[PDB]
Amino acid sequence: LTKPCVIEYEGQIVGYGSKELRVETISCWLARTIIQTKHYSRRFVNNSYLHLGVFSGRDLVGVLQWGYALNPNSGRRVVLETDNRGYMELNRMWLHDDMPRNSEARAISYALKVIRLLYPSVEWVQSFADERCGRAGVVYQASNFDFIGSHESTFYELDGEWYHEITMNAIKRGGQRGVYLRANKERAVVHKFNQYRYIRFLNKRARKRLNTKLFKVQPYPK
Amino acid sequence: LTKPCVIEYEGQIVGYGSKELRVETISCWLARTIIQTKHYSRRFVNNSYLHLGVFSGRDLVGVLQWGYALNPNSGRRVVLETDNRGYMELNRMWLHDDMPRNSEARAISYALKVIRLLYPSVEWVQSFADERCGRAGVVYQASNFDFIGSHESTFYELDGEWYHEITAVVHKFNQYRYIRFLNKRARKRLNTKLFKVQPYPK
Numbered sequence A: 001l002t003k004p005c006v007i008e009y010e011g012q013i014v015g016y017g018s019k020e021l022r023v024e025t026i027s028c029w030l031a032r033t034i035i036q037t038k039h040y041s042r043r044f045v046n047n048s049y050l051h052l053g054v055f056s057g058r059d060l061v062g063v064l065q066w067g068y069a070l071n072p073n074s075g076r077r078v079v080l081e082t083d084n085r086g087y088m089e090l091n092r093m094w095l096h097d098d099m100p101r102n103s104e105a106r107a108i109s110y111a112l113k114v115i116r117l118l119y120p121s122v123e124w125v126q127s128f129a130d131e132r133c134g135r136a137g138v139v140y141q142a143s144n145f146d147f148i149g150s151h152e153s154t155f156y157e158l159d160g161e162w163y164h165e166i167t168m169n170a171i172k173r174g175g176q177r178g179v180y181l182r183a184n185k186e187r188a189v190v191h192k193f194n195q196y197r198y199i200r201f202l203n204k205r206a207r208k209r210l211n212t213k214l215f216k217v218q219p220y221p222k
Numbered sequence B: 001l002t003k004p005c006v007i008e009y010e011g012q013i014v015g016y017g018s019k020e021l022r023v024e025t026i027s028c029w030l031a032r033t034i035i036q037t038k039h040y041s042r043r044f045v046n047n048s049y050l051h052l053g054v055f056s057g058r059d060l061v062g063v064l065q066w067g068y069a070l071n072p073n074s075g076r077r078v079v080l081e082t083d084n085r086g087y088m089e090l091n092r093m094w095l096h097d098d099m100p101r102n103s104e105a106r107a108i109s110y111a112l113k114v115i116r117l118l119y120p121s122v123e124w125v126q127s128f129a130d131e132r133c134g135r136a137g138v139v140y141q142a143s144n145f146d147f148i149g150s151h152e153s154t155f156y157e158l159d160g161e162w163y164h165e166i167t168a169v170v171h172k173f174n175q176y177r178y179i180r181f182l183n184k185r186a187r188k189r190l191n192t193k194l195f196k197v198q199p200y201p202k
Helices: A028-038 A072-078 A103-118 A135-142 A165-169 A176-183 A204-209 B028-038 B072-078 B103-118 B131-142 B184-189
Strands: A005-009 A012-017 A022-025 A048-056 A059-067 A087-095 A124-129 A146-158 A161-164 A189-201 B005-009 B012-017 B022-025 B048-056 B059-067 B087-095 B124-130 B146-158 B161-164 B169-181
Touching: A012 A103, A022 A103, A028 A048, A028 A059, A028 A087, A028 B028, A048 A087, A048 A103, A059 A103, A087 A103, A103 A135, A124 A135, A135 A189, A146 A165, A161 A165, A165 A176, A189 A204, B012 B103, B022 B103, B028 B048, B028 B059, B028 B087, B048 B087, B048 B103, B059 B103, B087 B103, B103 B131, B124 B131, B131 B146, B131 B169, B169 B184
Parallel strands: A087 A124, B087 B124
Antiparallel strands: A005 A012, A012 A022, A022 A048, A048 A059, A059 A087, A124 A189, A146 A161, A146 A189, B005 B012, B012 B022, B022 B048, B048 B059, B059 B087, B124 B169, B146 B161, B146 B169
16 A cells, blocks of 8 residues: 555646555546446436546556436535535445455545545535445445435336436436336336435534434444 | 657556557456447457557547457468467457547557557458448558458347347348458468458449
8 A cells, every 4th residue: 555645647636546546537428338337226327427437556447426416406405505516425336346345445535535626615425325235334434424314215126227216207307218217117126225324524614514303423324 | 749659557568559549458347348338239249358448648538359250260261371369350449439530540550569569479450341331441441451352241139239140130231351461471371262352442
């Protein structure tokens, strides 16, 4: 292990980390391609706007996608007075299986450095863990996220692909995927999962504005 | 200016090109992932064992996959006395739209420099183009390939993935065969009972 730092390319800040592990911005098309092929959902979401590759040496070995929540306006429901660009949600994360089992926590912490530099209006980020990947909760705890509660969510599985109920009923998006989705809605298998919400405050003053009527910092569920 | 040169990482030879356009080795899973998503066949082939990425600046913009022919033994059918590892076929290639219109031929040329360095046993390479894409043929002409004939080939379409006749919607297309001899001595062995260097289809 060596000391991470800011990574630049031709005067532009592009990432943060070490030679054996770092995060750098990648194109949107490339991040979507890897995620929809490798992630357990077999899908990307349109609300991602920060696309990061995980690199080890000269090899691309993972992808992190950050952006809006599935409903972009829901940020002010978690932390009071948060505008749609004042937060981020971890939409997707995948790392190659042959990577060391601490690589995910390092990449997440380095991604927060990128968020501080490239998106300084972001004051807190949130992520979700559920039973489809029990490792994510361990990763978020290792990355020093706080746990602020759980809730049940409805998912639709269609031909190996997984859709949140928000993504399912998002007619307002106008996507060629969503119209086909409600077309084959009767073939889809309905799933209800418990989701465990983690949060990481980048601006310590934003912790005071946590919506205590819905959320509360609690001991880790596992 | 940016002239091409061999690209190294920790002493080891990794690719060839310049900052604005180069090709370097990439992992097999990454090459297969991009190809089966972006290529028109929506599929990779198991015959590929050289996985190259096209880079412009710091960004990956394309993938080239070289390996055995679909029938790995058919290499000696094209060029007599060719071992199964004395040749390569361009199995898959894709490039992003936001690239200069000459980048695909310069990428194929840089891939050949990488083949000379990493696989010196390869004496010649071949590739195929479709009549629905005479543009892919001009690329090989700009890459100094020889055209050595055409043949009608049968394809199959199932679940958006396209399969050759080596194995549903049937198809019958013309396939044009191009060849590039990396060693001059290999040209003497061309199987002129079946293949001859010919003028490009124009």
